[model samples]
Target: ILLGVPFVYNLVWQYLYSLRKDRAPLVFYWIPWFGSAASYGQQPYEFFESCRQKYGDVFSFMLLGKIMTVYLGPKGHEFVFNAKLSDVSAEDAYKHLTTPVFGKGVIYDCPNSRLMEQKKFAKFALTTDSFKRYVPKIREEILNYFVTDESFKLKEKTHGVANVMKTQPEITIFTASRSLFGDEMRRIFDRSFAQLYSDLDKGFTPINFVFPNLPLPHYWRRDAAQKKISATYMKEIKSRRERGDIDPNRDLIDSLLIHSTYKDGVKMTDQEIANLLIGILMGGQHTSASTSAWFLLHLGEKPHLQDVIYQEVVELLKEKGGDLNDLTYEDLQKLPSVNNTIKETLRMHMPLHSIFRKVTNPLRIPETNYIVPKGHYVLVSPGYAHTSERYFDNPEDFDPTRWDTSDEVDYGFGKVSKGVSSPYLPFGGGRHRCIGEQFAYVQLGTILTTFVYNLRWTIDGYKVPDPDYSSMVVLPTEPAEIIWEKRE
Candidate 1:
């Protein structure tokens, strides 16, 4: 309101000098720096859709003073996700955001070559054999949380309104600690998870890139918590080395200690090992937590889907002559309903609705005049394509069978879509694709399987809660309660 009076000269120049066929069209705004943040923050996809309609699939919008060129749909996936390593730099774009949170010498703080090596060391532990062990370990954590945590009160209560945000995130943290980091990680952090998450979670919010270390209270706690957590790891890690307790099969920490020598024979340092594993496990928690919570809420909207999954789970146990408690990793794979529901939820509410890369070299749009200039940013959204009517029939519906088609491809780790151009890419695509895809399936599958077997729930409005996008991952709005009764 006040800025328009003082900035009449440049404001006119902004509209007067705005013709450029070789560049993406800019979304107009009155205020500078805070441009589109309010609109985009409220509902990002809706804003993207509005801009796409006004300016076609390729358009630019101001993101807190930075020029963000957004490309939507399958072509956008191919453009951003499959861009050449030399042209786009995720490190330069995100290093400011992550180097502090995940700490130095690992992941976003390292060179891309070094980071890729770190990812392989981490990925090697998340294999089928390891998943075979993680199933019961993860499942047991869920049961323990229900048994002990006030959020569930599963044994004493006949019915309760469970705030899934509290219940799911806690379960994800504990499950991840035991399955990926091994036993003592949980015992060590049970007292500190509250303090640590409050500190660390802020490090990932959208505001991190804007004056991230603004001498605020949050950054102080963030650094302190990271140091405390990593310091504890050094003690445990040193003890393991001294006691000759290290084994490749023990957990990710064990795996990294043995397998983390670089291709050129530079051994990974213990400091690097500690922070690297934290990046691998902690980075994934938000998405996994957000995904699990959405599915629970989405399933709440479809009470009948609950019955369908429950029947499938029961049939698997019936055929195996096993009890509900005897569910296995292999048993999880056999249940199509559980996996498909997960897919549907992701399609509707992809945890990462958008992803980005900083432009290092000018990138030309395919068969077009516009060239995204160097130093500008490019954003991609597979979630936009996930809902397009051109791909899925009845695109708005929550039918899990939408992914029943067998057209698939593999990229060393496992089978995913044939290419980035495929409409559904919830975990994303290309080199930066999530290595934890299969493990995530096992994780979500076990969590979902347990919920179906234990209880029946319904949301009050009979609608999935609205997505809050203030954080990096999209989560259902607060007080996301579910009324549930124990299944007999």
Candidate 2:
């Protein structure tokens, strides 16, 4: 009886909200608290586009209870992304779900100023200098994965069907662990860690976001695994410290241990350091795996394109008077096809479909009267602009060299755009832009180039897999597989 009353009240409230001219228009929804979750949750881009046609690019829709005002193009991107941190709060929006998985005193759990310092501390190890050493280790670990991992079985199989879902995650984890944490970490990191990580990642869902601290086994496992993994990192840190061995040049752990003092002269506690490590590793693992899986699936559609990068690799090796083993980070920059394919992959599939910032103050949409009120959230979809016809010619097509004219930008995690008005933002732009952009390019480029030298694969039916947007990160629909055979 009371459910019907609340539903009627919700209808009355939504109707009154619509009567206000200053507010962005709200999408129609029938159910009370669970407003428009069904539509927005599945096929978000399509849902946004439908509303854009009706609402003229800026509108509000209730998500659970949070009223989300979406601004659709480059101008909107500038509005939300370049807004003052005091006016918007990303930490408030993300901390509930992320804190349990990543732990306290790092990432969204800490103050934004501290987070800035943490990013600088982590950035110490991802330089042009670092990539030279990292490229060889990444290539070595990937080669190691092909030999021993069940998916590839390079020694036993002439042709094999490998699930890109499983294979890509394994390749990314191995490469990241060995290259970032060093060889001893390779021993500590095992395949089952993926399963453990998955358990922890389950806590990152919307269910956890809306209402954390449920008395459930999933939450139990998330906390327990979080404790164990954190201790594991602390254990390794202590061992190196006791041995009196620290090499800022060697690994992320070493760099963090050596140079973790903030500009204000405060040092990060060992536990906080461990927490930051969890946050940093977890951040890139999913994104790199997702990108690699999509690239492999896309490559499966065009084996001829595979040969294109392969010829570039072979010619470069020939020019250098060496073979596959001699390829280095500097040579990685020289391969346009290899690098452009990585660029195209990111453009076609941005890891984050949409990001939100909760408004701490009333913010007006420029050149319009609509004001997104305080306590409401704002949304920006870089992936949507990436595929829009207004920005690119034939945006849906996966043509890598279409980027021959598209460009590069400032490194050390600097803004890719003049401001936030560019449609081609893959790393996003502004203060909270991704710190791992350089590392990601090197990792994906190395992985793609390595695949070109050794393997050829085809999709199940010569069709590229469709993007699955329901998850927190975008993924290819499964069974995401490629038919692979070893190359001479």
Candidate 3:
């Protein structure tokens, strides 16, 4: 049976005496014929609020043909995200949901061990030592593209969004890719591999979200993207493997070629290497792009904040004797405001409705009478948690200062009144927590600091784009409008 049936289930049992009525556990909006699509697509937060106001905490609903229960507010988040990984696994949930798109060999379809292995590999790229070492490469490349005169067509009156986005993705990927692959690998990825990656990403547009991965346009697009991604990465891998491009003394690609273990004695194939590259590209690209854009937008809006950030950069430069050489891993961490700004941006705009985890087996939650069935998706969202009044004073307002005096351990907006792990998971929680959290911070920090310190800008209108928090992630509904000028 559908967990959340229409008027009968919703009106009678769902809302009648639901414990969530007080806090408003999110409800599934079922319109005649359209079902939950319109409401969910248009304003998910309102839908959450609607059910939250009526049902309170744990409420079930139908959205996009899935029968899932949403856990609203802090306590509900805790119940889902704080559950043991053995009981609730993220890999299980994502793999099941995306199996139609990412293929079994891809992302969710792969063995959990493979996922862990990939995570471990990516984590290695974000070490403090590596980050510090890659700073110069990062700042230099991005500066050459973004802050350089060539990037601005007519001295800041106008600039190319697609051009910047293209270079930005390339520069952004270059930092981590170089740390993993080296200069030679960097050349190959940016020059030869970039087009394929961009196509693959673009193919994953509205169709992926709106339509099922059947024998239709959506499926065709995803299939095409995957094929292009696979073909491009595989060609590189095959060339490297055959010609001994594996430099034992050099970068990640080299290391990966040498590192894949033998089950008995046979080394992993070239396709395996290509698959790994696909994983890294998929993991890094879009998240970094959105983060960089948002950080830049915030700086554009807050000129005073940009000025303060500039002061901070000036102080840092003076301390380092005005040497704007490459930024090192340690140096990236030393920039406080940049880091804080990125954190603030993330707080204001977090991804995912809930950290989608799946219940692997029926288990009784502690101090609760509920036993979640196997195959249930545990949706734990930090979007509301990061703005919950109980934790952050004036939680809805954009206040970067909230973190100024606060300890790093403090949760800022994500702080739960009850000392539990449920409510605030920006990088998610449990064993499968995001391994690239630190990398994400460094990437955004570098981009924001560089842009703010080197340039100044004004929005054409004083209006910030209305944030679209409908998708699995929050996005800006309208394209940002701004005029920028080089500083100095």
Candidate 4:
């Protein structure tokens, strides 16, 4: 019976579900519980493409026995991202996956109002004024990496190979920690901290996506790392509070220390603040680090684009009568090529490929006969529209000049107006849209500027690696190396 159970089970399950006339069309699956998991997990884009051809953008597949209905394109983007919070709940879909990583008291674990307020508090450091202060510190961290990091030591030769997968993660953590957590917090990113972050990051596995609690070593390690990381933040918070170091206008830590209170006059607990810190840092890390890595790897194939960026920096500095080291946040805004490079990179490789929500009410596809019954998950892939030929001209090619004619418009987070439609949604859209858009731009812009001014590099064979989607974020395949030489 154990051997024969799956086939018999799926036959019964399919027969029952296939009888529903109002529900979305289900993709054919052989397995009882693991429907489309292999095909979707291995190559999501290809699977989505194949399904889109057959299902016309709205379709359902069983993932680990859960009905996952995906709605593609602009309509899908708005439908999922901007759906009424009452009808579609992000907390239900993501809390299980995120709570273990982010902790118990905040983010998806809380009510939507609480999450909204927390986002407001966290957005303090992501402002234009805050970014202006962060640029120098970000540049400082990048330059510090070239000197202190083993990959860019330049001990014997001016040029050496650096694995972007390794370099960018460290750089992102350092820069993000420095600017957001402040100088004192930046000092604690020793060897053990990296490992702690790694262990915590491992909690975001696909297994965790389904069953967050498992009696596994990595799960145990993730729990341990979470406690340690959160405790570290708590310690910093207490020390800062005791030392009278809380600056209402400084980094995120200070902002949270002073202003992280609910609208109902409820103050966030110290542990909650600490957990929020970890959550915000981890959140930004996945997106920013992946984005920077993709941009660096993309730049390897198009080395001449580096020259264009370098010249853009030079001209901006000349206009400001400044040098490479003195580049400012305002100066970064002036570099069209630099910003365009980031926009283009995001088009090619938006880190989180799929964003999910859970249906609380029976959801109907607008203008379609399909109904997504409550208890099913709704998946949106803006990255598909980003790479689709239906939206972009020569979508596969990485061209920064494609954004040259594009004008900037506010999307609540920052100026990223390629189009209001699904064609260009790198930072996502609507209420749950990323608030860190401006901050990401500043961090990436500064890092790329620092690289363009101080170094030039290329892949050994000038070939970019395909994205490894198995990870939490879209990372390049291993051996993502770049040869670098300091500019004279």
Best by TM-score: 2
Q: Which residue pairs in model 2 clash with each other? A: none
TM-score of each: 0.95, 0.96, 0.81, 0.95
Model 1 lDDT tens row, 1-488: 56666467546755763777788788887776667888888888889888977988888888888888898888888899888787898887778787787778988887777877787788768888899999999999888887888877788986778899888888888888888888888776578666776687766667887766767788887877677667777777888889898888758888887888887999888777877766776777888888889889878888888898899998888887978678888888889999999888888888887788999989897868888888789999898888777677787788977667637654333455557887788888876778888888988898899988888999998877878988877899876978888895
CA lDDT, every model vs. true structure: 0.82, 0.84, 0.60, 0.85
Point to the candidate with the largest lDDT.
4
For model 3, the local distance difference test gives 0.60
Tell me how candidate 2 scores on lDDT.
Answer: 0.84
lDDT of 1 at 249: 79
Give the distance in Å from residue 348's predicted Cα in candidate 4 to where it truly belongs: 0.4
Q: 178, model 4: CA deviation in Å?
A: 0.4
In model 2, what is the error at residue 301, expressed in angstroms? Answer: 1.0
Q: Which window of 10 residues has the lowest lDDT sum in candidate 1?
A: 409-418
> Using lDDT as the measure, what is the rank order of every candidate, best first?
4, 2, 1, 3
Candidate 2, 45-118: lDDT as tens digits: 88988898898778878888888899888877888777778788888888887888889988899878888778
Superposition error at 382 for model 4 (Å): 0.6
Candidate 1 displacement at residue 387 in angstroms: 2.0
Off by over 4 Å in 4: 406-420
Q: Ten consecutive residues with minimal summed lDDT in candidate 2? A: 406-415
